[PDB]
Amino acid sequence: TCPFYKKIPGTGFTVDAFQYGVVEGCTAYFLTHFHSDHYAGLSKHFTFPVYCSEITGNLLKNKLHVQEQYIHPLPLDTECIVNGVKVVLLDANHCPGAVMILFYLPNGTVILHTGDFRADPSMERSLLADQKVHMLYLDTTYCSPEYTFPSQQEVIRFAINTAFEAVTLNPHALVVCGTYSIGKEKVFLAIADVLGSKVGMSQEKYKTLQCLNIPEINSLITTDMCSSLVHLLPMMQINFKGLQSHLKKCGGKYNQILAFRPTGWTHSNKFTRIADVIPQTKGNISIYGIPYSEHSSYLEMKRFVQWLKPQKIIPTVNVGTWKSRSTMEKYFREWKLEAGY
Ligand code: NI
């Protein structure tokens, strides 16, 4: 059944609750972002109102064929009324079009639902600064102190310099970047930019990127593989067998592949710095795992919460085991006691 952490008390609202059939008593279904665990269940046959960002709205229309009459896009950073309740959408610093939702309950309670987010100090100067938040529905994906990772900027720096050096040494080397969802576009766009190439990709993936309101996007991507030296492939094909196979398809235009796998976290983060990352190599193929996260590190999460000082925290990730739940509740208490709220 719909779990309690997907329901907004004192409203008829749900968040990211599309795979439970009709939820008894829901008058408006909110979608934080276009990732499949979140939209799971949406289709052209959905006939309830969906509230979301403009970008998520382009993807529902174009990729899932939801009918226009049911898609209700809202502008960001703007006080809006939905079924008699004031709401604001804020940027979540996750994937394109991803939002957090502020709900102002008629009784005076204020609720923030983070969706999926990477907490940042910049959020301390949004509309969130202007009033108190009583309950926080928190993205707890990496809520454990082992989860450190570098900034997005430091990771992109590493990737740009790696690719540029490799291709300047060998002008017959191909760069390939894996993907399975929206998010992490900066990786492949930053590499294509330093190399003076467009990124080439399948027709489905080009369609997906064309929904995303990226500036000058017509100049940066293409479906013509032959004219591109940065290819995107399904993440599943980013392995030695998959890459050899792909290289055969390029018709002796290339004799080397340098490939990037933007993971979330991996245990080499516990020891290794970004400067000291190395590839797995077999022959003329090298594969780099880079820790490009669109979720909060443990420290970024802790800082955001200690700044927000909520009265109650409701986790939305890792809730399925008692050991996880218990561990998270302990960090929350530590954070509250250290900060004094
Ligand atoms: Ni997500």
Q: What is the CATH number of the domain that holds 268?
A: 3.40.50.12650
What's the CA gap between 288 and 118, in Å, rounded?
23
Nearest one of 67, 59, 11, 22 to 39, comparing CA atoms? 59
Strand order, beta sheet including 13-15? 7-8, 13-15, 28-30, 50-53, 71-74
Distance of CA 154 to the CA centre of its chain: 18
Between the CA of 36 and the centroid of ligand 1 the distance, in Å, is 8
Method: X-ray
What's the 116 CA to ligand 1 centre distance in angstroms? 5
* 171 C-alpha to ligand 1 centroid (Å): 36
The rounded Å distance from CA 93 to ligand 1 centre is 11
Domain co-membership, 276 together with 320: no
Q: Shortest CA distance to 334 belongs to which of 145, 136, 128, 140?
A: 145
Question: 168 CA distance to ligand 1 centroid (A)?
Answer: 35
CATH of the domain at 36: 3.60.15.10
Ligand 1 centroid from CA 305, angstroms? 20
Burial of 22 (0-12, 13-18, 19+ CB in 10 A): exposed
CA of 183 to the centre of ligand 1 (A): 8
Count of the separate structural domains present in the chain: 2
| 282 and 235 together in one domain | yes
Q: Please list all protein residues whose beta carbon sits less than 5 angstroms from ligand 1, which is an ion.
A: 35, 116
For residue 256, report the distance from its CA to the centre of ligand 1, in Å: 33
Give Cβ neighbours of residue 340 (< 8 Å, ≥ 6 apart).
none
Distances in whole angstroms, Cα of residue 8 to Cα of each of 5, 12, 118, 271, 314? 8, 7, 22, 41, 11
User: CA 303 to CA 121: how far, in whole Å?
Assistant: 8
Whether residues 141 and 163 share a domain: the answer is: no
CA of 182 to the centre of ligand 1 (A): 9
State in Å: Cα 287 to ligand 1 middle. 24
Give the whole-angstrom CA distance, residue 68 versus residue 234: 29
Rounded CA separation 307/305 (Å): 5
For residue 282, the cross-strand partners are 285
- The three-state DSSP-derived secondary structure of the chain is CCCHHHEECCCCEEECCCCCCCCCCCCEEECCCCCHHHHCCCCCCCCCCEEEEHHHHHHHHHCCCCCHHHEEEECCCCCEEECCEEEEEEECCCCCCCEEEEEECCCCCEEEECCCCCCCHHHHHCHHHHCCCCEEEECCCCCCCCCCCCCHHHHHHHHHHHHHHHHHHCCCEEEEEEECCCCCHHHHHHHHHHCCCCEECCHHHHHHHHCCCCCCHHHCEECCCCCCCEEEEEHHHCCHHHHHHHHHHCCCCCCEEEEEEEECCCHHHHCCCCCCCCCEEECCEEEEEEECCCCCCHHHHHHHHHHHCCCEEEECCCCCCHHHHHHHHHHHHHHHHHHCC
Specify whether the CB–CB gap between 105 and 111 falls below 8 A. yes
Separation of first and last alpha carbons in the chain: 34
- Cα 257 to ligand 1 centroid, rounded to whole Å: 29
If asked whether residues 240 and 336 sit together in one domain, one would say no
The single residue listed with the structure tokens 């200690």 is 306
Q: Assess whether 136 and 95 both reside in one domain.
A: yes
Mode of pairing for the β-strands spanning 280-282 and 285-291? antiparallel
Label residue 188 exposed, middle or buried (CB < 10 Å: 0-12, 13-18, 19+). Answer: buried
Backbone angles phi, psi at 20, to 5 degrees: -125, 20
Same domain, 78 and 165: no
Q: 94: CA distance to ligand 1 center in Å?
A: 7
231 and 174 Cβ atoms separated by less than 8 Å:
yes
Range of the domain at 24: 1-147+296-341
Residues 94 and 183 in one domain: no
- Resolution of this entry in Å? 1.9
Q: Are residues 32 and 171 in the same domain?
A: no
Query: Nearest 5 degrees, angle CA 297-CA 303-CA 304?
Result: 90
- Residues sharing a CB contact under 8 Å with residue 253, sequence separation 6 or more, in sequence order: 172, 174, 226
284 in the same domain as 244: yes
